[PDB]
Amino acid sequence: DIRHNKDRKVRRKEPKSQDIYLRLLVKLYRFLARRTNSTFNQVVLKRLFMSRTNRPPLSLSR
Amino acid sequence: TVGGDKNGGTRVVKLRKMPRYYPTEDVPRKLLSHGKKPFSQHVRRLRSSITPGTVLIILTGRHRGKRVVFLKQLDSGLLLVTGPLVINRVPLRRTHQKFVIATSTKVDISDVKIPKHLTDAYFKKKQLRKPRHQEGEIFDTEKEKYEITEQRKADQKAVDLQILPKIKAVPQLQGYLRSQFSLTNGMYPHKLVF
Amino acid sequence: AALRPLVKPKIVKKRTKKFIRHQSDRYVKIKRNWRKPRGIDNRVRRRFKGQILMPNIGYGSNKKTKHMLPSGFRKFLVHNVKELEVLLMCNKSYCAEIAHNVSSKNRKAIVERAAQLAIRVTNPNARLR
Amino acid sequence: PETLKKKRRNFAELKVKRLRKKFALKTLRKARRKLIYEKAKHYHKEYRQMYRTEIRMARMARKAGNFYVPAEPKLAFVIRIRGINGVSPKVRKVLQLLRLRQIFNGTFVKLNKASINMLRIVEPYIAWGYPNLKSVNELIYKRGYGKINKKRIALTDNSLIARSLGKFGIICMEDLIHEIYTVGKRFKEANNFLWPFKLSSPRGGMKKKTTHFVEGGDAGNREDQINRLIRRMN
Amino acid sequence: SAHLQWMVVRNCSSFLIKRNKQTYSTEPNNLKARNSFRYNGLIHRKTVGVEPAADGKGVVVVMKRRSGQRKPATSYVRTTINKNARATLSSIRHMIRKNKYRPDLRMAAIRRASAILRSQKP
RNA sequence: GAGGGCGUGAAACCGUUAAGAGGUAAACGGGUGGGGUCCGCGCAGUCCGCCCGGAGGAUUCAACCCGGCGGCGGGUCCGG
RNA sequence: CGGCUACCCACCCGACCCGUCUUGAAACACGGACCAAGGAGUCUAACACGUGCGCGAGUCGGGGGCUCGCACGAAAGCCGC
Ligand SMILES: [Mg+2]
Ligand SMILES: [Mg+2]
Ligand SMILES: [Mg+2]
Ligand SMILES: [Mg+2]
Numbered sequence: 077d078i079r080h081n082k083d084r085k086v087r088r089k090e091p092k093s094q095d096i097y098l099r100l101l102v103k104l105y106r107f108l109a110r111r112t113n114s115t116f117n118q119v120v121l122k123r124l125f126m127s128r129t130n131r132p133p134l135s136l137s138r
Numbered sequence: 139t140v141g142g143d144k145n146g147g148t149r150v151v152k153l154r155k156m157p158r159y160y161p162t163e164d165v166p167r168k169l170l171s172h173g174k175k176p177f178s179q180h181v182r183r184l185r186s187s188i189t190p191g192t193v194l195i196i197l198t199g200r201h202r203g204k205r206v207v208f209l210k211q212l213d214s215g216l217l218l219v220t221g222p223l224v225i226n227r228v229p230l231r232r233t234h235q236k237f238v239i240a241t242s243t244k245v246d247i248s249d250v251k252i253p254k255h256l257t258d259a260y261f262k263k264k265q266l267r268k269p270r271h272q273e274g275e276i277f278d279t280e281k282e283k284y285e286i287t288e289q290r291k292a293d294q295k296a297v298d299l300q301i302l303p304k305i306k307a308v309p310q311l312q313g314y315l316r317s318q319f320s321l322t323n324g325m326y327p328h329k330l331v332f
Numbered sequence: 333a334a335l336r337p338l339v340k341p342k343i344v345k346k347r348t349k350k351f352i353r354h355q356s357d358r359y360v361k362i363k364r365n366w367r368k369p370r371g372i373d374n375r376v377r378r379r380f381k382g383q384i385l386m387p388n389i390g391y392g393s394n395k396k397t398k399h400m401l402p403s404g405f406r407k408f409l410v411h412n413v414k415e416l417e418v419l420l421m422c423n424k425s426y427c428a429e430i431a432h433n434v435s436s437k438n439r440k441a442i443v444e445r446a447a448q449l450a451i452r453v454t455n456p457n458a459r460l461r
Numbered sequence: 462p463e464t465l466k467k468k469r470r471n472f473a474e475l476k477v478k479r480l481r482k483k484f485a486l487k488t489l490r491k492a493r494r495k496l497i498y499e500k501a502k503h504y505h506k507e508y509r510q511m512y513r514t515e516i517r518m519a520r521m522a523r524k525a526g527n528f529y530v531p532a533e534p535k536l537a538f539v540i541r542i543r544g545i546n547g548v549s550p551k552v553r554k555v556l557q558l559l560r561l562r563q564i565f566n567g568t569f570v571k572l573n574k575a576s577i578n579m580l581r582i583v584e585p586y587i588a589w590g591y592p593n594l595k596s597v598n599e600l601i602y603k604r605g606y607g608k609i610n611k612k613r614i615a616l617t618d619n620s621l622i623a624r625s626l627g628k629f630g631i632i633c634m635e636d637l638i639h640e641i642y643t644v645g646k647r648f649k650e651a652n653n654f655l656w657p658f659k660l661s662s663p664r665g666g667m668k669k670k671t672t673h674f675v676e677g678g679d680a681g682n683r684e685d686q687i688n689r690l691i692r693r694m695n
Numbered sequence: 696s697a698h699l700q701w702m703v704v705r706n707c708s709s710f711l712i713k714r715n716k717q718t719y720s721t722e723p724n725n726l727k728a729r730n731s732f733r734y735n736g737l738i739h740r741k742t743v744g745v746e747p748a749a750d751g752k753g754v755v756v757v758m759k760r761r762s763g764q765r766k767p768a769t770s771y772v773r774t775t776i777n778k779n780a781r782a783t784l785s786s787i788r789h790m791i792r793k794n795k796y797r798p799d800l801r802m803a804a805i806r807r808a809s810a811i812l813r814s815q816k817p
Numbered sequence: 818g819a820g821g822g823c824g825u826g827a828a829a830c831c832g833u834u835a836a837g838a839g840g841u842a843a844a845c846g847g848g849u850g851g852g853g854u855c856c857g858c859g860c861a862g863u864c865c866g867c868c869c870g871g872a873g874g875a876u877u878c879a880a881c882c883c884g885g886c887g888g889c890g891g892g893u894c895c896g897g
Numbered sequence: 898c899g900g901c902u903a904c905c906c907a908c909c910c911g912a913c914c915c916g917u918c919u920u921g922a923a924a925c926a927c928g929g930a931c932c933a934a935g936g937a938g939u940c941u942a943a944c945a946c947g948u949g950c951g952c953g954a955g956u957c958g959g960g961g962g963c964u965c966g967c968a969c970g971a972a973a974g975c976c977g978c
């Protein structure tokens with residue numbers, strides 16, 4: 077048949093942080109990206125699950 | 139609904155009032171299936187070997203292999219048969235289609251003139267009891283078994299006096315119906331011709 | 333005249349036997365509790381025919397009838413009268429079970445409160461004289 | 462209030478707004494019903510003509526003492542015969558490309574110079590033949606499964622076909638059967654939309670599964686005899 | 696701030712009992728037993744609750760006043776209804792249907808009132 | 818049933834009593850049957866709650882109005 | 898009357914004794930007579946990666962000092978030239 081080594085998507089679907097405000101932001105932006113059908117909402121929801129490394133601090137001059 | 143009163147004019151009455159008690163976590167509703175009929179609306183099937191005037195063998199009944207004559211098919215799907223009480227002591231009995239063996243013998247019964255008052259509702263088993271708790275007597279009903287007369291004997295005497303002139307015309311039918319079917323050691327049903 | 337629960341389906345069990353630890357019959361030091369055999373040439377690990385069965389996720393009972401008693405209720409453990417009134421809304425599917433360390437003086441009060449609230453109790457009329 | 466009495470008429474107006482929409486949808490659905498009926502009738506006439514012309518040409522050729530050879534069938538049904546384990550990679554890759562992963566499943570293939578050699582490479586593991594119209598009909602009706610997405614949805618309503626494949630003109634299942642049996646410009650999409658037909662085991666029993674059909678087995682070319690096996694596999 | 700308080704109360708909070716596979720919230724002002732956001736009676740600005748009367752007959756209804764918040768002394772108004780099995784059942788329904796006042800959990804309040812009246816009947 | 822290394826008192830082992838069985842060592846998994854202890858029911862006699870039409874009795878309220886308190890909703894954001 | 902089971906018995910089928918070294922273990926390869934208790938990847942320093950938190954071109958008082966003697970205070974609070 078087919079091997080099952082790559083069938084599970086390794087991406088994360090839930091923020092590992094326990095911050096209550098971040099949890100509420102995720103609960104809001106998930107509903108937005110699910111209803112409004114906005115790719116911007118989708119990407120801003122995906123960027124909230126990211127860790128401290130995947131969210132680099134953007135400077136002011138940049 | 140508005141009805142008159144004694145004092146204060148007339149007050150409106152609301153039929154089908156609101157219920158007073160609500161059971162918690164009630165069961166939801168079904169999915170509204172189709173094609174499902176009650177038993178009273180089912181179509182009744184009959185085998186070609188079971189024709190009016192055919193001999194049947196009562197295998198699973200309380201008579202355990204008696205030969206009876208079939209009269210007609212009722213409305214609920216059960217066969218109304220009867221054996222001559224002089225030949226075999228079986229009254230007008232209800233039987234099942236799949237529970238009888240039909241013999242290839244035939245009897246001219248077209249002029250049966252069956253009454254119209256007897257139907258599936260005429261053959262029922264009614265049980266009643268006086269007390270609600272337990273007592274020594276058996277419900278005051280099964281102690282003296284049912285012995286209804288003047289109606290179970292009237293129709294029987296009306297039908298057998300017409301069936302017997304048709305059975306006694308056959309040279310050896312009153313003895314054949316008197317006899318009881320049985321499986322001996324030498325024959326098997328898969329080779330026997332009924 | 334037991335308390336009638338809500339609608340209940342015919343609970344079917346995939347396996348009615350309890351899984352037995354390998355070689356737990358020969359030695360009495362080996363408890364009946366199941367332990368995963370991790371031998372390099374053991375028969376149970378490679379599942380030879382005629383050997384004992386290993387418990388896996390396949391034997392999982394139905395989620396609609398899981399944790400359901402044969403009477404049709406799901407048990408919930410209680411200790412006093414305060415933790416009994418919480419089962420007031422779920423009396424048709426959930427039932428009460430008094431703890432074992434509850435005294436006979438405070439047990440009859442729980443039984444009377446459950447009878448008033450029409451709550452099924454798995455162990456009624458217990459420790460009476 | 463008077464605003465509530467006017468909202469009472471606005472409710473009937475919204476009801477008419479929904480009613481006109483559903484009435485237009487019902488009329489369009491009836492029109493599509495008539496369309497698929499007419500298309501099925503035309504396809505039946507085309508099948509009649511194409512089946513009669515094959516005998517017409519042979520009869521008109523045999524009168525002059527001259528033989529007539531028909532065209533090679535452009536569609537072939539392939540079924541997997543051998544198991545999974547114990548296969549070379551050269552043939553396992555072709556079995557994966559032919560959408561034949563598990564045992565006892567079959568798919569339609571457009572016969573070309575490349576497909577013929579692809580089937581010859583994996584000949585010991587497949588049984589291929591030229592399907593009949595009734596065999597195609599049975600395989601599309603009984604074992605018909607399409608994938609509107611990465612899931613295998615059963616083919617029950619024509620809307621399932623019209624939503625995923627209606628952009629080419631294959632709105633109905635009769636259109637699908639016609640596009641399969643009369644391979645043309647839009648055959649690849651119609652074939653890829655269909656899930657590999659999971660077939661059951663045969664009834665009469667397969668004789669010498671490991672041997673070629675010519676030697677007396679079953680794994681091989683069964684040009685006209687594959688329908689007698691499809692009747693028992695389905 | 697209902698969700699902010701629920702994100703703290705949903706766990707690590709008192710009154711919660713989950714010894715078995717089911718969990719119970721068990722608040723002094725709560726209709727059902729489920730530990731849920733739509734049924735919690737301590738975090739919302741409007742809350743309805745029913746309770747058996749302390750005298751031995753009737754049903755007391757507690758409503759969140761919402762006039763003065765953060766003042767638990769007068770934050771709850773308590774009324775007593777001692778009528779037949781239907782008059783109380785209709786008054787409690789009106790108390791939630793006429794006013795907006797958290798239109799949901801109306802059926803929950805009605806079921807709890809009927810269940811406690813069933814126990815008050817004997 | 819705490820009797821001078823005596824709180825509680827498990828397993829290996831042994832004695833007695835009861836039950837069952839016995840030529841392929843015993844033991845073990847799958848599926849039944851038989852016996853026994855025990856559990857729940859009282860076994861041709863036990864289902865619950867809602868609405869309506871009838872059969873008899875007792876009560877205040879509900880329709881509506883009035884007195885009146887407590888809470889809900891927004892308009893003027895009115896004096897703040 | 899109903900009852901799966903941690904009770905006993907019988908028949909039918911399948912069923913070699915567990916653990917590790919090994920390509921190969923039931924082996925005429927090793928350890929185990931049985932039972933109860935104890936028994937084996939810990940801690941410190943350093944490094945690398947990933948994750949959570951706070952601040953952010955800044956970050957860190959772990960080193961000392963201050964307030965009042967304190968069971969909890971061998972804590973916690975603060976330093977601001
Ligand atoms: Mg794997
Ligand atoms: Mg990987
Ligand atoms: Mg090995
Ligand atoms: Mg066969």
Ligand SMILES: [Mg+2]
Pocket residue numbers: 819
């Ligand atoms: Mg003692």
Ligand SMILES: [Mg+2]
Pocket residue numbers: 823824
């Ligand atoms: Mg001692």
Ligand SMILES: [Mg+2]
Pocket residue numbers: none
């Ligand atoms: Mg003995």
Ligand SMILES: [Mg+2]
Pocket residue numbers: 916
């Ligand atoms: Mg070990």
Ligand SMILES: [Mg+2]
Pocket residue numbers: 918
């Ligand atoms: Mg070595």
Ligand SMILES: [Mg+2]
Pocket residue numbers: none
């Ligand atoms: Mg060697």
Ligand SMILES: [Mg+2]
Pocket residue numbers: 373922
């Ligand atoms: Mg070994």
Ligand SMILES: [Mg+2]
Pocket residue numbers: 926
């Ligand atoms: Mg050895």
Ligand SMILES: [Mg+2]
Pocket residue numbers: none
């Ligand atoms: Mg040696």
Ligand SMILES: [Mg+2]
Pocket residue numbers: none
């Ligand atoms: Mg040794």
Ligand SMILES: [Mg+2]
Pocket residue numbers: none
């Ligand atoms: Mg130990």
